[PDB]
Amino acid sequence: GSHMHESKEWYHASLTRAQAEHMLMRVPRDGAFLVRKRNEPNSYAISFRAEGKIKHCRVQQEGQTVMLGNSEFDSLVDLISYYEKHPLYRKMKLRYPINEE
């Protein structure tokens, strides 16, 4: 569902980019990730570690769906489920959620 991520432990709402990097740098591990709401309308970021570096990917909420690049999904939860199964960046998949404390 459209707002089902609001009770997912990997979703951190208005966590800042710096706060997200701090969390990802505590015990660095390729495949670690969290999702945050950006300070732009209808915009989220996946913050993650892949191939030894920390990166951020923008996700757009467009009407009822979400878009990552050219790929559309029904919802953020569906997007995250897909990228647990198929690579998000190079060969890295979402594997180790950083949970809200």
Partner: peptide
Amino acid sequence: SSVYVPDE
């Protein structure tokens, strides 16, 4: 100046 993974 936030750097993100390139679009597309």
